[PDB]
Amino acid sequence: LKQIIMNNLKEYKDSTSPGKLTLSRNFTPTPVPKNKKLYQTSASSFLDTFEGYFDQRKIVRTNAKSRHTMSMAPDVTREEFSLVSNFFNENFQKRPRQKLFEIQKKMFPQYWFELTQGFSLLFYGVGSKRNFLEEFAIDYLSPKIAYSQLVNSIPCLILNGYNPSCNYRDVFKEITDLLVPAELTRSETKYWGNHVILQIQKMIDFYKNQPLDIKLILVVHNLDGPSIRKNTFQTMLSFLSVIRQIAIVASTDHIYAPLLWDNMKAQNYNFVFHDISNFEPSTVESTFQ
C-alpha cells in the first residue's frame, strides 16, 4: 500500500483537531493535596557509559578512608551460613523457578534439530547451568536419536571442568576406550609430536566418509573452569568437534569467556548462542573456592 497509505496518512494527518482528543473517558481530575508537611524536602552523573566509568574513577581523600572491617559485625561458623543459604534456595523462589523451568522446555525439539546438522551448542547466562543440561541430554537426546537411527542407547560421558585437576590426557584415554579408534604408525609421530593431536587428525579422516549417524555425546560444565580453561585442553576440544558422530552441549558463566577463543576456533567449533538465564544459587558449586 506504499503509494496510497502515505496519502492516507498525509490526508488523515491534517484532519484531527488537537483540542478534542479525550485520552481517558471516565477520569476525575487531580485535586490539590491538602498538607504541605508530607512533601518533606529531604553519586556521580553517569552510571552506565564510558563517561560513567570516568566519573566513578577519580581520586579520594585518605582521611576520608573509613578503615572499617567485617569483624565490626558478627562472624559465625559457616555451617549455619550454608544451612540458611540452602533454605532460601529451596523456599524463596522455588515456585517461580519451577514455572520458568517448565516454560524453558519446549525448545528441546529445536535443540535436537540443530544438533542433527552437526552444530555444537551453547548455553550462557546467569545462575547455575547444571540442573538444565543433565536432564536435557539424558531424557531427550539419547532415546530419540536411538529410535530415529533405525540397537543400544548412545552413551555419554560428563566433563566437570570446574575441577582444578581436570586434565586432558585422561579424557583422550576415555575417548580411546569408548570410541576405540585406530592407533598411529611410526612414520607420522614426527619427533615427539603429541600423540593425541595426531591421533585425532587421523580419526577425523577415518570418519570423513563413514555413515552420517551418531555414536556418542560428551557434555561439559563450566568450560572456563580453573584447570580446564588452558590452551591445550581448549585446542583439543576445538579440533575435536568436527565429528558428525558426536557433538557437545556447552555451559558458560564468565563475562569475558568469549575472548578465550580464536576466530579459527569459532570457525571449527560453531556454537549457536542460545541465552538461558535463571538466577540460581549454584549451591553445590560452592565447594572449590
Next chain:
Amino acid sequence: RINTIKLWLKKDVKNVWENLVQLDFFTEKSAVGLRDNATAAFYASNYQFQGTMIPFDLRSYQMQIILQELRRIIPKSNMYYSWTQL
C-alpha cells in the same frame, strides 16, 4: 651557528645501529652475555628475553665509554669536538 650538512633518516640509522651493537660499544641494561657451562647455555636457548620479544627500538641499552673519556681520546681538531663536552 652559521659544505652543508645532511642528516640521515630513521631507516638509515636502522642499518648502522646493529653495526654499532655488534662492535661491542653498547649492551642491554640487565644483560648477561655468555654463560660459562653446558646447563646454563642450555637454559639460555629454552627461555627467551624481553629484549628478544619487544621490538627493535625500545629495548633498554647500556654504554661502554663515557663522555669525558671520549673527549680526551678523540682528535680534538674535529668539527664535532665542540660537541664532546656536556
Next chain:
Amino acid sequence: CLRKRIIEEQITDCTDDQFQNVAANFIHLIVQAFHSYTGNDIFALNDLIDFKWPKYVSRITKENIFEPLALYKSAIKLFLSTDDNLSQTYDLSIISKYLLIASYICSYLEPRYDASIFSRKTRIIQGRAAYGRRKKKEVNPRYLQPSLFAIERLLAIFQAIFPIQGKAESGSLSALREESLMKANIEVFQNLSELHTLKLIATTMNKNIDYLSPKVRWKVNVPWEIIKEISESVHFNISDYFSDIH
C-alpha cells in the same frame, strides 16, 4: 646485463677498456655515496650492487658514456635513497584497522589528560571537568617505552572514536530505538583474539599464556609509522593529539 644493454641501445662504439672504465667510475660513485653508510665492508656493497646495477644499466646510453656526470645525475636517485625493500599496505577489515589505532593512544597518553578531548556529551547534572595539561611536556613520549593498561580503557576509547554508523532519519520512531553506536558484540572479541596470534598486540610474555586474568597487563609492539600508515589511508586523524605537547 652488459651485453643486454649494448644491443638494446644498438650502438657500435665500444671496447673492453671503456667497459672497465665505466664500471670503475660507477663503482667510484657507489663508494663515494655509500661509504658513510657502511664504510669498509664488502658483503653489503656487493648485495646492493647486485640489486641496483640493472637500473643504472637501463639508463646508460651513448651520450651518457661520453659524459658520465649526466649519467650519474640520471641515476642519482638510488644513490640518494636505497629504498631496498617492498600505495596500499593492508587488505584487512575495518575494526582491525581502527582498534589498533586506539591502543597506541591508550599507552602514550596519560589516563587523566584525555577526558578533555575525548568527550562529546552535553552535561546535565552538576559537575566540573579538569583543566587538562597545564604544563607542556618536552620529551614527546614517542621516544619512550610505552605503559600498561586494562582492556576496558580500550573499550571506552574505541567506543568514543568509532566512526559513525547506524544512519538515522530524525523520524517519529527512527532514532527512538536505533541506539546508533557500536556495542560489545562478539566479532570485536574474535578479531582482537586474532591480533594476539598476529603478535601486534603484545601481552606480558608468558608460556602457558592466559588471556583471561584480572591481573594481566597489556601493551602493543608497533612504532609510530605502523599507526601513521593507517590514518590517511582510512581518512582518520589523530596526529593532532600528539603534535601539540612537544
Next chain:
Amino acid sequence: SLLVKKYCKMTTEEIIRLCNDFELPREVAYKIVDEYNINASRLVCPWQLVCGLVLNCTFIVFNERRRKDPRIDHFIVSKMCSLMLTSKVDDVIECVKLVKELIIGEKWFRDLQIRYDDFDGIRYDEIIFRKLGSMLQTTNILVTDDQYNIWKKRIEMDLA
C-alpha cells in the same frame, strides 16, 4: 525554550497541572512529586526530569490505545513539544531516555510496570519466547481471526 532556562523553581500544583493536562491519575502525579521533592537538590533544569517522568508514564499506561492506533505517538509528542514551546524534539527524546535510565530500578516503578504491562511495549509472555531463542514467537504479521470476522461486514454491504 523551557530547558535552556537554568535553575528554575517548581511547586506541587505546577507539575500537578502539567501531569493533569493528560488526565492521568493522581497516584502517578503524587509519585512524581515525591521523586521531585526527594531528588530536586542537585538539579540543573527540573523541566527535563518532570517531562521525562510524565512521558514515560503516558507510554506505559496508554500502550493499549497506542497499539490499536499508531497515530497517537505523533499526536502526544506534538502536544508535549508545543506545551514546552520548542520546535526541536531530539531533546525531548533525550528527556525520555535519560529518565528511563535514571528511574530504571525502583520498586514503585516495578509495580507500575507489572500493573500496566508495557515491558518495552510488548507483553512478558511473548517477549520471553522472543528473546529465549525460539521460532514459535508470535510476530503478528498475520492478523487475528476476529479482525477478519469484523472486516467481512464492510464488504458484505458492498452492493451500495
Next chain:
Amino acid sequence: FADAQRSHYTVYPSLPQSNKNDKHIPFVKLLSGKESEVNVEKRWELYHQLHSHFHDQVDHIIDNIEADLKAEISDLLYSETTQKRRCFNTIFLLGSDSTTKIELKDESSRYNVLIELTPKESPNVRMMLRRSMYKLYSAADAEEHNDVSYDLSLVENFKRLFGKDLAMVFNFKDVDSINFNTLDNFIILLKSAFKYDHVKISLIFNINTNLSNIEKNLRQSTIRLLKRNYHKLDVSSNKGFKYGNQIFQSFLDTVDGKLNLSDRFVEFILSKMANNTNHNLQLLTKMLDYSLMSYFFQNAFSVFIDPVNVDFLNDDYLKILSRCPTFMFFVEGLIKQHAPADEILSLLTNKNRGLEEFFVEFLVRENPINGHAKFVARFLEEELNITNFNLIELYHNLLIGKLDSYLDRWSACKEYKDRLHFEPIDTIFQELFTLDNRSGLLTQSIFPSYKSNIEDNLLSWEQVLPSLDKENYDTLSGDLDKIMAPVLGQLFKLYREANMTINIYDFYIAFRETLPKEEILNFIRKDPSNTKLLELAETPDAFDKVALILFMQAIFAFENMGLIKFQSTKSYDLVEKCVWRG
C-alpha cells in the same frame, strides 16, 4: 562419591522399551494440530533432500577453490628460473589463514619432501633442525629401500647416500607467532648450504598481517637477500567474489521462484560479510542453513512448494492464507476499480474453488525479481566481464530501488540501465514466502551482544521473573517475592551507582537499609523445617546476620564472574570494579 565430585568420568544411559512412532523427528504439527503427519514426513524428506542438494555444491565449491589455489601455488612454485643459482624462491601468502595443505610435484631426477614447522615445535633452532632432518630421512629412505645422525651434513651428503639430488620446500605454518631471534638463527644456519652445486630449496611464509608489518621486526641482515626473488599473492576465501557470487546464484536457482529476501536481511549479510575476511563464506553458509532450518520449522506452507501436495490444499490453510494483507490490498483495489462485484464473489472464500484456483495461478508465477537478478548477473559477466562484485549488494540495491544508482558506480551499462531497472514493488502473498530478521533471532543466536544482554537481565529481572499473582499462598515466598527484589539485581544497582572503589562494611549497611525486617522474619517463620534456623532467627540481629550471609555468598558468586578484582591482599576489606554497563 557423589555424582559430580569427580571429573571426566562416564555414565551409561538407560532406555525405555520403544515408542513404535514414525514421529521420531523434531518437526511438529503446526496450526494446533491442523497439519497432517504425512505433511510432516513430506517436510522432513524435502528439507533433507534440498539440504543435501545444496551441500553437493558446497562440497564442489570448497574443493574447487582449494584445487584452484593448489594449481596456482604449484604454477608459481615450480619452473621459476633463477640465474644466480645462489638464492631460493621465497613466497608470500598475504593474509592466508594458514592451515591448507599443498601438493608436491615429482620432477624425476629430483627427490622432494616438504617441510612444515609450527610454533609448538620451534622453541630453539636445533630442535626444529632435527625435526626437518628426521622428516627428510624417513621420507627419502623408504621410497627406494645404516643410520646417519640428524644434521645439515646429511642434506649435502644426500648424493653419496641415495644417488639422487634433492629439492626442498619449506612451509612456516604460523609465521607470525614464533620467536624471531630463533627464526633469524635458523635462517642464518640454513643459508650455509649453498656451496655444493647439487641442491635447490624454497621457502614460503604463510603471512597473516602484512609484509611491511614484520619485515622490519626482523633484522635487515636476513631481509637483504630476501629482496632478491619473491612472489606475492592476494589470498582469502572470498577472492574477487568469484565463488561467493556463485554460491548466492546457486542458492537462488535451487529454490528459485518460491522465496525472496528483504532489504534488511540483505544489508545485514552484506555488513557481516566484511567483519572477518579470512573466514567469510563458511559463516554465511552456516547462518543460511540456520535460516532454512527455522523457515521449515515454522512455515506450515512448506508442503505447498512441491506441486504434488497441491491436492491436499485444506480449508484451514485456505482460511489462514486468506488473511494476507497484500491480498487484502488487491481485493480493495479491485473494489474501487469496479463498482460491480461479480468477480470478487466468483473468486473469494464464499466459493473456495475459485480461491484455490487463484492460489495455484499466482503460485506458478516466477517471482520475476530473482530471475531479473540472475540475468542481470549474466549481463554483467557477459558485457562488463566483471567478477569483483557482490550479487547480494545488487540484490539490496534492487530492493531499495537504487539499483540504477549503484550500477552508476560502474556507469558502463548506462545505455541499458533504464531497461535493466526492475521497478521494485511488493508482490501478493509476500508475507508467507520471504525471509528477513524482523523476528530478532539471528542476532540473538549468532552475533549476540554478550554482556549487554547479560546486564539487561541483571538490571531488569522482570523480563524473566514470572509475573503471577494468585498462587502466592501455596508458595512459601508468596508474600515475599512481590515485595522484595532478589539479591543480585539490588547488588548490581548499588555496585554500579557506587564509585570506583567500594568498601565492605559501609557498603553492606547501605545495601542492608533496603531490606524489610519484620517481613523477612515472617518469611523465615513460614518455614518450620530448619530448627537451627528457627533458633538463629529468634534473635533480632539474626536479620543482620542473614543479610550478611546472602551478601557473602552473592559477592563470592560475583567474584568468579569477572566483575571484581579482589584488592588489597592481606586485608580483604575493600574492592575495585572493572566491568561497566553499556
